[PDB]
């Protein structure tokens, strides 16, 4: 039983990082996009301007 409880606490740790970076990486993405619609302001609006 507590054999079975390290395998399913790695499984748990797993998890846990898998979402870190999946997240990490998918807010990014997202993000970064919602920067580029910040770029269509500031890029445009300096020749609007």
């Not at 999946?22 to 269509?40: F, P, V």
């Amino acid at each position: 039983e507590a054999i079975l409880n390290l395998e399913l606490k790695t499984a748990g740790r797993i998890n846990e990082v898998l979402n870190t970076k999946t997240k990490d990486q998918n807010i990014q993405s997202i993000t970064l996009q919602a920067e580029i619609a910040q770029k269509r302001l500031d890029m445009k609006y300096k020749q609007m301007e």
